[PDB]
Every structure is written in C-alpha cells, then in structure tokens.
Design a binder for this molecule. Structure first.
Ligand SMILES: [Mg+2]
Ligand SMILES: [Mg+2]
Ligand SMILES: [Mg+2]
Ligand SMILES: [Mg+2]
Lengths: 171, 169
C-alpha cells in the first residue's frame, strides 16, 4: 500500500473522520485506478449518494421558510442537484487532490476546470468530480451506520452558499 | 367533510390511516380543483415524495444481497422510478378513484389508461397518476412526522412485485 496515505487532510477539510477508511478509499477510486485491489471503484457509492443528496436538498428546499411555490422548488432543485454544480463544489473543497485515477485525459479536463473555477459555458465539466461529490456522500452515509443526518452535517456547509444565492435569485 | 368523503376506503386499500386527513386530501387535490379552498394542491407534496421514493428505492436496490453492479443498479432504478411505472401502480391501487380535479381531458386520459391496463406502446400515460403516487408518499411522510420508515411500510408492498420481477431480469 500507499492507498490511504494523506486522507487525514481531506477529513480535516470536510470535518468528518471515517471509522472505516475503506469507504473513503472506495469513494475516491475511479474505475481506471487498477492499483486499488482492495475495494471496488466509486460507482456503487455514487449511485447511493446521488439519491441521498437529492432527498436532503429536496427536504431543505421544501422546509425553507421563504415558502417557495412548486415551480420555484423544481427550478431550485434542478439548479442545485446537477453534475455541474456538484463538480464545482468538489473542486472547491479539494476533492480532486484525493481522487485516484490513471488517466491523462481526466487530468486535462480536471486541470482546466479547476483553473477556470478559481478565476470565478464551453469549459468541459469533468463529470467525475460531480460523481465523487455523490460517492463521498454515500461513503459517509455507509460509514456512519446509514445516517442521513451525518451526511447533511457534512454536506450542508458546503452547499449553503449556493443554496442561499439561488434561493434569493433563482437561475 | 364533503371533501374527504369516502377516503376511509382508500386508507384500507393501502393499509395506512391518516392522523390528519388534510395531507391525504392535499395529495389528491389537483391544481384545477377549485372546490378545495382549505389545503394547497398536491404539487408541493409531489416535490417531496419524488425524492423520498428515489431514496427508498435506491437504498433498497443498493442493499440487495445480489450486489448488483453499478450498471445494473442504474438500469433497475430507471425502470422503477419513472412516471409510467408510478402511474401504473397508482391505478392498480385505485388512486384514480380518489383524485380530485376539474378537467375532462385529464379524466378521459385516465379512463383510457385504466382500461388499457385492465386489458393487460400506443396509449397516453396520465402523468398526474404518477404525480399522485409521489404526492401520497409526501403526504404519509408529513402525516407521520417526517418518517421515511412509515412511507416505506406503505410503499414497499406496492412496489415489491415489480422490484422482484425486474431484479430477476
Ligand atoms: Mg438523482
Ligand atoms: Mg453521478
Ligand atoms: Mg426524483
Ligand atoms: Mg412528478
């Protein structure tokens, strides 16, 4: 191994410590990362985290005292639950530094996207960065004994600025 | 009281008795149903129910001991969480008999779909039936104090046949 080396720094950035680091490793393992022979890649956990985040965001929007009407609920959800915004948040919280892959093509797309985001429509969005925003939510869920509340404790702080920005002026 | 007349039979069909029948009424109230001026229409409950069902079905699929691959999980979820399957289940459980709306076109589309399902690509699927499969889940969630487990106690029995069938194919 060197597989889990360095993960403590990520845990500090999102403020969550894994009990079973295998979940965190799985979350960050791309299908091309053949050097990880101890867990699967992140796809199963992405499948799970995807629905988890959809539910948590939906619930938050539904409960917001601003009492959005249905068309607005729908627009807000569309704008907060999509691969592009999930990627932008992943790179904002350094997920790309712990991602594991073997892909010069991913490197290129991620690198351009990360640069472009820091200076902030035809920039290519790296879908994998959105996918690990989802997979990590799944990992946290699984690590905490299937606790939605733990996931939201971690994820709400990262999403709150866009939630507030969009809920004041809906795209 | 005019508005909730006969809802006790629906409650028996799905095996859930509402603590506050307002949520049941709201779940079945289409935006066109101008006679109801005591609750909102179903759309806010549909918004919530939609994500609730996607979570519960995703979770079920992920936990299945066959350890479906990602590709399979994704295909099963698409086959199980779509407006058409939801509309077919709503109708199978008589949701259409309690739907409140003012729209001949909608009821015509529902009638034809209900018939087509009894006779069982061409047929028009009434989106509103899928929408109220979602809204009722949202309603049960609210009525039960935002309990995901109560929703699934009601909804799993309705979905199990299709979950088991698609999961074997
Ligand atoms: Mg989703
Ligand atoms: Mg994804
Ligand atoms: Mg949905
Ligand atoms: Mg719907």
């Amino acid at each position: 191994n060197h597989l889990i080396s360095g993960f403590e720094n990520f845990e500090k950035k999102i403020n969550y410590r894994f009990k079973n680091k295998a979940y965190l490793l799985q979350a960050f393992t791309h299908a091309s990362y053949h050097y990880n022979t101890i867990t699967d890649c992140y796809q199963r956990l992405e499948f799970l985290g995807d629905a988890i985040l959809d539910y948590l965001i939906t619930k938050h929007l539904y409960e917001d005292p601003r009492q959005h009407s249905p068309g607005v609920l729908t627009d807000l959800r569309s704008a907060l639950v999509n691969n592009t915004i999930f990627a932008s948040l992943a790179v904002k919280y350094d997920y790309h530094k712990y991602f594991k892959a073997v892909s010069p093509e991913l490197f290129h797309v991620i690198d351009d996207f990360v640069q472009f985001q820091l200076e902030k429509e035809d920039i290519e969005v790296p879908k994998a960065m959105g996918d690990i925003f989802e997979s990590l939510a799944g990992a946290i869920y699984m690590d905490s004994g299937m606790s939605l509340e733990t996931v939201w404790q971690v994820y709400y702080p990262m999403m709150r600025p866009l939630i507030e920005k969009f809920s004041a002026n809906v795209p």
